[PDB]
RNA sequence: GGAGAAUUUGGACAAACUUGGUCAUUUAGAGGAACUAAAAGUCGUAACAAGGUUUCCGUAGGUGAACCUGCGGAAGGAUCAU
RNA sequence: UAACUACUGCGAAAGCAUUUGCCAAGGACGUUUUCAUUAAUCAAGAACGAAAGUUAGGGGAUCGAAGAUGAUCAGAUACCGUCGUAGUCUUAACCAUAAACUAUGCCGACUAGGGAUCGGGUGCUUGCACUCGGCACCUUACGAGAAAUCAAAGUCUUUGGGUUCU
RNA sequence: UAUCUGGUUGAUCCUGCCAGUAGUCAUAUGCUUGUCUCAAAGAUUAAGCCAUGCAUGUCUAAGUAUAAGCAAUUUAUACAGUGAAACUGCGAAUGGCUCAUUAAAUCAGUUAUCGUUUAUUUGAUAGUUCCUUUACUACAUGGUAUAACUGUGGUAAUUCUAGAGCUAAUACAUGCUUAAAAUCUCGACCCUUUGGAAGAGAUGUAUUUAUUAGAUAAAAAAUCAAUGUCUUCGGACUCUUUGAUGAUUCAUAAUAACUUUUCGAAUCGCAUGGCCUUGUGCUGGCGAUGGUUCAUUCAAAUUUCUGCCCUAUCAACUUUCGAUGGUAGGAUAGUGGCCUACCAUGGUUUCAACGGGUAACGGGGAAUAAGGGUUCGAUUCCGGAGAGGGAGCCUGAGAAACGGCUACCACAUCCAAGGAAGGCAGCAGGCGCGCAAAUUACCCAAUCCUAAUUCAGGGAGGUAGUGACAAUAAAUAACGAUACAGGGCCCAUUCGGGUCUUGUAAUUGGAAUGAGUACAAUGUAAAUACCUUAACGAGGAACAAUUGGAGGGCAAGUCUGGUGCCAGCAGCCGCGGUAAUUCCAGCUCCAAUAGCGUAUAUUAAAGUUGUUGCAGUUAAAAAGCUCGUAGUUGAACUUUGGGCCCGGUUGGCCGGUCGGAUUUCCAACGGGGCCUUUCCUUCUGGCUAACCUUGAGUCCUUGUGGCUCUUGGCGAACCAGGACUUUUACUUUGAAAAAAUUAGAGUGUUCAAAGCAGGCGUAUUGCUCGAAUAUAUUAGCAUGGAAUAAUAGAAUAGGACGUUUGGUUCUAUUUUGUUGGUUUCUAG
RNA sequence: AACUUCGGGAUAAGGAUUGGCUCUAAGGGUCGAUCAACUUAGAACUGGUACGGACAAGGGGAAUCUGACUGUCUAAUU
């Protein structure tokens, strides 16, 4: 007899599950971005339709309304402020004709890669992973993370771990011991 | 079931005492007192959750057995006591006098007040009748009966309470114009002026309130509590004043503080 | 010197048990008569062409089996026509 | 109850055809008559309902299930041929069904040309026109439809006149 | 988040289904399984049965201690500290579990109690108790009768208890207590007076009945029952008291009595003070528990309105022996056929009664979701019911209680066979049942609950274990350089310059890393696990991803070997009879992936249930025909238009600093009040606020962007009064419709599912924003509108209005002293 | 109750009651008075729970064979 703890599922299976010209599109998509599966793709479409069904919600709803002006302006700004929707852009109307490439472009894997660091965005999902790359102060080692454009000036790699500084790594601590015992005696 | 219930289970509290969820199961019942089950605030959720002295509901009892905290002038020792609107609880040490009333949100604030006003309350009469051996008694919105009161004083007038000794110092008549503090309904909380009254013989009485922002509303006379005259509120009210922003309105009023 | 146990009269409440009655729900059964799988076997050839007696409807009788015949309909007829 | 006898009439349908009476009934038309919403469609419930069939009296010409019987045929108690019972007709009761079919519920409005014809009316220049109401019919298809086809089976994704049944 | 595709044919267009496709906090099952967070879990069948353990007890300064108990270090010849036991008090009626029953019942929203009970809490509240008040009766304090305890015992056996002896009370049973006064009845005495007075009794509260007050619609006096004023004396003749409700026989107060006569403190701690009459004088603080009634709170009970799934192969049901109503009683806390007596003949029903079924507990909700819907809701919250089945009942404020009793029924335990003891639909566990579900673990640290209660208790609850129910995030590799096929463009000689780089090699490089193991911290009641972290831990053979497919539908091979209509596959269409694109395999490839398949159910697809929105000539389907009751539906018509005037809301026009401002005006769009043959309920005092009332006029931006107040005023600016008001539907706004859940704002839980947090300082004694908002009808409530749709009205006028003009009929206010008798004028 | 020729089956089956006493009610005739029968229903009380107290007075049900039924004959074995 505790609350009940809620949750949700964060994405949607496609209808018809072999379209041709869905399964090119789709892994187009995780060669470009560099995806683990077709479910991340499918989590970021089922983002996109609920923010679409929301701003079709309010588009119904005569301007100059509280409702309209008080969550579109919310919807907006939170969009704005994750850097998928341009500073251009700001009617309601552009929300709706937002694509999924907009939001990929915005998480942390790619902005790795779009800031030098990595090379490629297949490294870049290594090196999050590998808790080198850090927002700002901390270590974020989920490649799915949003980056919020008031942040992306702060990502570097850790004062923790390699690269950044502090020791050498493991390898390299295993690989320096190795050729020291051998030199001497 | 059988007989009266002594659990309360934490979803099926009050909304207004802001309890979280998960920490939990229960919520602590008020016991039997002066103000109804759903309009009080257990003093165990004051201390602890309101004011952030207490942690544990153990701390709470630690505080009360010391004979600190005092409740309209006299000490209780009681985790749930029915503590409600209008009441002064008094602590020793700090020296924090506060009176319980209603932010616009519905719900109790931490209203902290000076050492003069907690010599009062305000009491909204109820009921009014001739008790035994002929003698009049007014009965106030915390259930205190006094006894011989002023033959002016009908149902629904304010009256103001002594506390230490429990009198009626003075009242104020239920008309128009009149200050007023809504308890109860979705416009719990908010402060105004009355316009007028409509009757309804044999329902429900309602009174259309304005306020200082011209904008009207309409409650059921249950839920009004005469205040004051007109800009003369007896008591000290809270930041806010009993407005009521719109979302919006309250959405430019934290841009200002956004700027820090 | 008032409490007060067993016991006991009548009463309502009334379990439970016999006994019929009734409704609902399951289920056994010699044998019987159907249906389906079912298309292949046997016997015919009823229907589809004027299908070799145009076909079909209702009804009634006949009978290895499809079916056959009477009376009255229909054309969905093989006639939109004197 | 022939011929007359028809893409003619009447009837709620089933149905209804020799003559003349009698009995009530009915549509349509005509109306500067009358009442004034009394109506439309209808679970339940009712009347009527071809033929066959049933019960009991009459009747019993003809045709004819069954049956008899001669051919045909491998068979032929089938078609064909000759007889023939119930039946076929009627009275009093029943039965309640048919491809009882236009395989098209009823009421209302609107959408398109045409000539025929039946009933009533009006004008006449007296056999023609107009008119209301009927049975239909021809052309086109605006539309409709899976198509055949349909002046309704149209006015339905530009989707709502009312209502019963399946 | 509005999508379809394969399958009837030789081919076609249809109807139409079958099959595919996606989801499922939706169960099972198969194979597979590294990590973090989160976490359902014996409902479905059997509300079947249960071994064992545990789940309810409780103590403060403050009811009762001679423990023959522990102390004692010296607060005590009464006790005094800390305390087993037992009495007393309170609790055990909550919680937890389950979903069998149950279909106008439950339940939901909404009412009601002027129809009742209520431990507790909180607030009020109690001079009136002896009755001979001169016999006794202690109030410096009243009576036994019992536990534990000590002995003596029984019984096979139990939370069995007998006999004897002790002794407490906030247990039990008694019983005094303390101010005046007023008012009533009774009445000694004297004096017949418009006579009055000793002293006698009673008067708290509760109980029961009867009676009485609890007024009020405005102004006049006659006539006195007179026999009471106030002595101005013609008898001036006044002033009186009346709360609440929409509404009462209400509250409350009297009066007469009533009562197996209720309560009105024989109680307990810690402080010890002040008066002196230094006796153990009188007086006195803080507060514990108790107690009558009222109020309050926590409740309870009953209750109004509307709303429930399938079924007519249920159309009549209820009424003998309560069915519907009436009167009286009884009973209840109380209303009521709740029950009894007597009387009446009613009550429900095609707008579906009654009956049957439900693999039905209701609701909040869940799944799916263009819109509309369809399906589910045993299950975290709310309500109900139950504790093997029935009934009965004690205790208590509260139970028809089951971790209470009694009986019967069913089932089952121990026995020395005489008897005794039972109730997991609490926690864990077992059996059974089955497609179908976890440990006989740790803990009161958090959440809160109970108690005499800061301490005790709590399988409520929390913590771990088991756990691929479901959900979140997310490893299984990354980057070089020769390499080796080229492709981009520039040498274009035919040598190709490796030109810009992209693949493939069982080719070789140094890096990176948590999965795991593990110092130690952290975490926690104690751990465990996360989070953090020394040390240790990838070379591909290893730390090795699977599950399903590869003819079509449907994404991926007429590649190799096997079998030869067999084995087998194949949701469906179809494959397989010796080149199998389909079987068993290998290779290769596709899809989703720590998951993927299968089965059943369900939603979408399904406009294949059709209100939105299907079909009925011939595909399934128009009744043989007409009549006809309910039902559904139903022609037109009644203030329309015009002229005004005043505030509003957006764009204006100069948004002038690309963002916000105002004047009058350009408008558009909305709203109100006037006038026009124009209900705009009506009148009766509150109050006339106000502004054509003017005792000082020019205080003052374009005379349409205007005042210092006196004197009846003009009451639609604004409250309660009688007075009577056709009645619905519909719609606006408000209010309501628990929380959680849904949508949704804010907030970097490292991201996220989540959560309700958080955020800034001089981080050295602190400041601050939050925990919004929206939706949820059908019913009821308040409110504006008066189109649409229904409804009523004056036709044998019993019609409307009326200052008329009579009759008649009651009503009663300030008077006429005051009750009362009592005719009028009134006033309605 | 089956069944049925719809008439039956049927007293189907199966139950309960019944005395005595003391009352109450209803039901009439003739001219408000007056006269008069028995029938039925109810209540109280009462007893060794008896009571159609003797007498009188059906056993019933489920099926089969067979004749439809009432009726008739072997006086003296059917
Ligand atoms: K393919
Ligand atoms: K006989
Ligand atoms: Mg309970
Ligand atoms: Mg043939
Ligand atoms: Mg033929
Ligand atoms: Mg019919
Ligand atoms: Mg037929
Ligand atoms: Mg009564
Ligand atoms: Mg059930
Ligand atoms: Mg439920
Ligand atoms: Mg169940
Ligand atoms: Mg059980
Ligand atoms: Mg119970
Ligand atoms: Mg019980
Ligand atoms: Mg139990
Ligand atoms: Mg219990
Ligand atoms: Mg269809
Ligand atoms: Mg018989
Ligand atoms: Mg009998
Ligand atoms: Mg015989
Ligand atoms: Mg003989």
Redesign the interface.
């Given at each position: 007899?505790?609350?009940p703890?809620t949750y949700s599922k964060t994405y949607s299976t496609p209808k018809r599950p072999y379209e041709s010209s869905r399964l090119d599109a789709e892994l187009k998509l995780a060669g470009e971005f560099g995806l683990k599966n077709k479910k991340e793709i499918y989590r970021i479409s089922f983002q996109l339709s609920k923010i679409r069904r929301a701003a079709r919600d309010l588009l119904t709803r005569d301007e100059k309304d509280?409702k309209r002006?008080?969550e579109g302006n919310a919807l907006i700004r939170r969009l704005v402020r994750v850097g998928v929707l341009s500073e251009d852009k700001k009617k309601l109307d552009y929300v709706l004709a937002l694509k999924v490439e907009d939001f990929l472009e915005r998480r942390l894997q790619t902005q790795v890669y779009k800031l030098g660091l990595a090379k490629s965005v297949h490294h870049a999902r290594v090196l999050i992973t590998q808790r080198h790359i850090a927002v700002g102060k901390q270590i974020v080692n989920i490649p799915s993370f949003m980056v919020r454009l008031d942040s992306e000036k702060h990502i570097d790699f850790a004062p923790t771990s390699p690269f950044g500084g502090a020791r050498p790594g493991r390898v390299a601590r295993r690989n320096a011991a190795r050729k020291a015992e051998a030199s001497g005696e | 079931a059988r007989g009266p219930k002594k659990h309360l289970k934490r979803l099926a509290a009050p909304h207004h005492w802001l309890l979280d969820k998960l920490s939990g199961c229960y919520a602590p019942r008020p016991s039997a007192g002066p103000h109804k089950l759903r309009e009080s605030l257990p003093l165990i959720v004051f201390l602890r959750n309101r004011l952030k002295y207490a942690l544990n509901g153990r701390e709470v009892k630690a505080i009360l057995m010391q004979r600190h905290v005092k409740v309209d002038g006299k000490v209780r020792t009681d985790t749930t006591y029915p503590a409600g609107f209008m009441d002064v609880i008094t602590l020793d040490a700090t020296n924090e006098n506060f009176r319980l009333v209603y932010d616009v949100k519905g719900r109790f604030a931490v209203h902290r007040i000076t050492d003069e006003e907690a010599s009062y309350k305000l009491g909204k009469v109820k009921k009014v009748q001739l008790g035994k051996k002929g003698v009049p008694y007014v009965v106030t919105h915390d259930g205190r009966t006094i006894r011989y009161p002023d033959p002016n004083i009908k149902v629904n007038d304010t009256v103001k309470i002594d506390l230490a000794s429990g009198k009626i110092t003075d009242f104020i008549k239920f008309d128009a114009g009149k200050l007023v503090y809504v308890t109860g309904g979705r416009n719990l909380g908010r402060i105004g002026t009355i316009v007028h009254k409509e009757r309804h013989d044999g329902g429900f009485d309602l009174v259309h309130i304005k306020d200082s922002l011209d904008n009207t509303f309409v409650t059921r006379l249950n839920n009004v509590f005469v205040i004051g005259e007109q800009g003369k509120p007896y008591i000290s009210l809270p930041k806010g004043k009993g407005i009521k922003l719109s979302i919006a309105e309250e959405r430019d009023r934290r841009r200002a503080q956004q700027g820090l």
């Open positions: 007899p505790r609350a703890r509280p002006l008080f | -």
